[PDB]
Amino acid sequence: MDFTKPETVLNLQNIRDELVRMEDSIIFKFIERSHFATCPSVYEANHPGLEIPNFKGSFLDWALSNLEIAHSRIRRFESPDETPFFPDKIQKSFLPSINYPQILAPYAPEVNYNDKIKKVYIEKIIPLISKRDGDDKNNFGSVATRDIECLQSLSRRIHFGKFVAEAKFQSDIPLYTKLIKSKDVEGIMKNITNSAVEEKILERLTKKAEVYGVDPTERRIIPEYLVKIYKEIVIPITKEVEVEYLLRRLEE
Amino acid sequence: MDFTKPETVLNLQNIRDELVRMEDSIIFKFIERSHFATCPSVYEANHPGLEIPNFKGSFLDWALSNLEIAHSRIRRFESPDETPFFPDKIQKSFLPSINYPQILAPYAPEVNYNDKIKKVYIEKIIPLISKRDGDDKNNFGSVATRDIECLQSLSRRIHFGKFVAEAKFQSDIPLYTKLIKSKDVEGIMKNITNSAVEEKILERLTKKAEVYGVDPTERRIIPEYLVKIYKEIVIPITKEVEVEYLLRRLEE
Numbered sequence: 001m002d003f004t005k006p007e008t009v010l011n012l013q014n015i016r017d018e019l020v021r022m023e024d025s026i027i028f029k030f031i032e033r034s035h036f037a038t039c040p041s042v043y044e045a046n047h048p049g050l051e052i053p054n055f056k057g058s059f060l061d062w063a064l065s066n067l068e069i070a071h072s073r074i075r076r077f078e079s080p081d082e083t084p085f086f087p088d089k090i091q092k093s094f095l096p097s098i099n100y101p102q103i104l105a106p107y108a109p110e111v112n113y114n115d116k117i118k119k120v121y122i123e124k125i126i127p128l129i130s131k132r133d134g135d136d137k138n139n140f141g142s143v144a145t146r147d148i149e150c151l152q153s154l155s156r157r158i159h160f161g162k163f164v165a166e167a168k169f170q171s172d173i174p175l176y177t178k179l180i181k182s183k184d185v186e187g188i189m190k191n192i193t194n195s196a197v198e199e200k201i202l203e204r205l206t207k208k209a210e211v212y213g214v215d216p217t218e219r220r221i222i223p224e225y226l227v228k229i230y231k232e233i234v235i236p237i238t239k240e241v242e243v244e245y246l247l248r249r250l251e252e
Numbered sequence: 253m254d255f256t257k258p259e260t261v262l263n264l265q266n267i268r269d270e271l272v273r274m275e276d277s278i279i280f281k282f283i284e285r286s287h288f289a290t291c292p293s294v295y296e297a298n299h300p301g302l303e304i305p306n307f308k309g310s311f312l313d314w315a316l317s318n319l320e321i322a323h324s325r326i327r328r329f330e331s332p333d334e335t336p337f338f339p340d341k342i343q344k345s346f347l348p349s350i351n352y353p354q355i356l357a358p359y360a361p362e363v364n365y366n367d368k369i370k371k372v373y374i375e376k377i378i379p380l381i382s383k384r385d386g387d388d389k390n391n392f393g394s395v396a397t398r399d400i401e402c403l404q405s406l407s408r409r410i411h412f413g414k415f416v417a418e419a420k421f422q423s424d425i426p427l428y429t430k431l432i433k434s435k436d437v438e439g440i441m442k443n444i445t446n447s448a449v450e451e452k453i454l455e456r457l458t459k460k461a462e463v464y465g466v467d468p469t470e471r472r473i474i475p476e477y478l479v480k481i482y483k484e485i486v487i488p489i490t491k492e493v494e495v496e497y498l499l500r501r502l503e504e
């Protein structure tokens with residue numbers, strides 16, 4: 001995949017490879033986050049102790065928004081595969097731009113489910129992957145920086161669905177043009193879903209959950225929980241991105 | 253290991269478990285960096301296309317130096333296990349300070365091999381883990397961020413020598429005080445060298461390298477290379493840390 005050669009990107013064999021690459025990535029990031037307690041205070045807005053000056057919002061938000069502003073100056077968000085968490089906070093780059101071709105439809109950057117991703121990460125994911133409940137006062141920084149790594153991988157994996165959608169669109173213009181014009185979300189859903197491919201994915205994740213992080217010489221991740229996160233969070237939100245992208249495909 | 257309870261830190265068994273957890277983190281991060289080319293320009297100071305406003309140094313240095321300043325404001329370098337690449341840039345934290353009791357000698361912060369770590373990583377590690385030689389101008393930022401992750405992990409595992417050296421100095425004060433007095437570098441070296449354990453680590457590394465990153469149902473990391481990195485880079489620079497620390501123990 002070369003984001004300057006449209007044809008390597010809109011290649012489904014390639015898209016598949018990247019998603020695989022991305023799942024191992026997410027797993028590694030989950031295993032690192034698993035070494036700390038849940039640290040409820042890292043996520044509370046304006047927590048009594050972790051009180052950031054001139055700042056409403058959480059300790060995580062501060063660390064994340066700040067990372068984004070730095071990265072944005074170094075062209076982080078010009079790339080079609082990178083979606084910001086604080087879109088309103090990011091700056092313009094001070095580096096010469098890379099003239100990315102127009103691969104996805106021009107409204108692509110508006111399809112942004114990051115608010116929802118940060119929310120379920122905090123509410124449904126931290127609980128299943130953290131070491132124990134409660135604050136670990138000496139590791140709030142270790143925790144937030146790990147949270148950002150997890151959030152950014154999930155966000156890309158999930159937003160990758162825009163690429164997946166376009167690739168599916170090109171392969172059967174007639175089918176998707178019918179569905180899109182008639183706003184048949186159920187038809188789009190039914191079509192972009194492959195129950196046999198998902199089954200395989202969930203199987204792969206269980207075995208990867210079983211061999212990763214564990215010294216080959218007990219389990220940093222609970223297989224059931226990793227499968228649960230994919231089945232209930234990652235896969236479903238990716239389809240939400242896909243159908244939203246498609247319904248606006250033939251707009252202007 | 254709680255850096256506010258001295259008795260937990262100077263526990264050889266606790267130290268050994270920490271280092272073993274760091275192995276996995278280093279491996280995971282090598283796998284991540286491995287997806288990209290060598291990107292020589294990221295490491296080149298003031299490179300034509302990667303010219304940053306009001307800054308001398310590489311793309312890597314800007315990204316790293318900015319991360320540390322940010323993290324220092326939120327107490328990152330108050331922790332004894334964190335050593336910065338840019339000591340003269342970090343600032344005081346704006347959050348209430350955690351009172352870490354003195355555990356290592358007062359001069360511990362002065363033992364900082366981060367420069368050597370950055371050079372060997374660039375010159376000897378990158379060529380061994382990268383996908384291919386050459387610049388990939390669409391991934392300089394993605395590359396710089398994977399590098400930081402690698403460096404911060406390498407830096408923490410290597411400077412943990414400081415803690416290893418002390419727990420040992422306590423464990424056998426008459427001997428080490430003897431060696432330190434007559435500056436028996438070879439003796440401290442031999443005394444700190446735990447041979448039969450080194451073979452074990454290397455066997456564990458080979459096995460982990462063989463299992464992580466690969467779909468359990470490809471070898472992202474070459475085991476022989478991981479063994480070479482630890483055998484010639486990590487384990488040896490850790491010892492130079494231990495040694496420099498010990499030679500200045502009674503220097504007060």
Ligand SMILES: N[C@@H](Cc1c[nH]c2ccccc12)C(=O)O
Nearest residue numbers: 074075076079390391392393394
């Ligand atoms: N891959 C793109 C976008 C990107 C990802 N992470 C980044 C961090 C900094 C700057 C850019 C990026 C690049 O390397 O430019």
Ligand SMILES: N[C@@H](Cc1c[nH]c2ccccc12)C(=O)O
Nearest residue numbers: 138139140141142323327328331
């Ligand atoms: N573990 C310490 C120091 C630390 C490690 N990584 C950090 C990143 C940001 C801030 C602090 C840290 C803490 O969380 O406070």
